[PDB]
Design a protein around this ligand. Structure first.
Ligand SMILES: C[C@@](C[C@H]1CN(c2ccc(C#CC3CC3)cc2)C(=O)O1)(C(=O)NO)S(C)(=O)=O
Ligand SMILES: [Zn+2]
Length: 297
């Protein structure tokens, strides 16, 4: 059978929050079968625990924020993308502040630290959410769709309407391509034209060339440039993989994004969950006949 996965060893990292600029200590710990991914604010007494689930998303402005009363866990999408890409079902994520550290702006440091610690297969069938019917959400010129598909694939298209793109960005990934080699290293990005307005909203306080592609009209301010010709759209795919992981189980289906951000991604998840005719929970007693496969643990 395809088994549930957790961490083999604890992961420890220190960084800063992209939006808050606050120093944060992160600890990833193994968890029992069917725990899912749970964020723990260990700076609070008592510790506040928030399951990484669609129902717990409270804010979607320039990041995905989990909320429980007046307690927040901000910018979960990049770490969730790493956990999704590596097939981690169960884990406790301890944080000493309200925001996950931004690291280098990609999922690269998280995939490296997790793979260095190693994974542990658990004695329980991994549960998957299989798309049975097409589900689409739209708002103005933004669109996000789930389509039935025997595997897992993501398509993204965005007209950024910005001179750095030299006059529309698009990418498609079928994950059977490497999440690690082709998507994990894609960094988040910011535009100089938005920075004054963002800082006024208390956003991007920790933003810099050390943790994002910084654009100023025609220029990429980062001295060393881009990691991929299409780094921008590849990061949009990374974000979608992280946001989609708030379903609580890996998907068997196709996601198509059209200028879709954290807000529309969450609305798609909520619409899907409400439409029980469009999905079902499945397990694979035999990995040889399954439409997906994972890297060795
Ligand atoms: C929201 C987003 C972009 C991030 C990245 N970002 C950002 C903004 C400004 C700067 C900057 C700057 C210059 C002052 C140094 C860096 C990152 C921000 O506000 O949100 C993201 O990746 N979320 O997961 S995106 C790609 O726009 O969806
Ligand atoms: Zn992002």
């Amino acid at each position: 059978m395809i088994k549930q996965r957790t961490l083999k060893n604890i992961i420890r990292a220190t960084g800063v929050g992209l939006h808050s600029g606050e120093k944060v200590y992160l600890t990833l710990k193994p968890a029992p079968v069917d725990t899912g991914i749970v964020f723990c604010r260990t700076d609070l007494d008592p510790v506040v625990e928030i399951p990484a689930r669609a129902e717990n998303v409270g804010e979607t402005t320039m990041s995905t924020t989990l909320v429980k009363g007046d307690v927040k866990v901000d910018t979960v999408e990049h770490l969730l993308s790493a956990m999704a890409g590596l097939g981690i079902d169960n884990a406790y994520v301890e944080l000493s502040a309200s925001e996950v550290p931004i690291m280098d702006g990609s999922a690269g440091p998280f995939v490296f630290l997790i793979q260095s610690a190693g994974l542990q297969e658990q004695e329980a069938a991994k549960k998957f959410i299989r798309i049975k019917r097409e589900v689409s959400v739209e708002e103005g010129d933004k669109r996000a769709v789930f389509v039935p598909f025997d595997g897992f694939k993501v398509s993204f298209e965005i007209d950024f309407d910005h001179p750095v793109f030299r006059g529309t960005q698009q990418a498609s990934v079928d994950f059977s391509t490497s999440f690690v080699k082709e998507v994990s290293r894609a960094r988040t990005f910011g535009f100089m034209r938005d920075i004054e307005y963002l800082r006024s909203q208390n956003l991007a306080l920790g933003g810099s060339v050390e943790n994002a592609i910084v654009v100023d009209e025609n220029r990429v301010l980062n001295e060393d440039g881009l990691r991929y010709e299409d780094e921008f759209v590849k990061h949009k795919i990374l974000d979608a993989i992280g946001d989609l992981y708030l379903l609580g189980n890996s998907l068997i289906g196709e996601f198509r994004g059209f200028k879709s951000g954290h807000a529309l991604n969450n609305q798609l998840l909520r619409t899907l969950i409400a439409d029980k005719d469009a999905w079902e929970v499945v397990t694979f007693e035999d990995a040889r006949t399954a439409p997906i496969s994972y890297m060795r643990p």
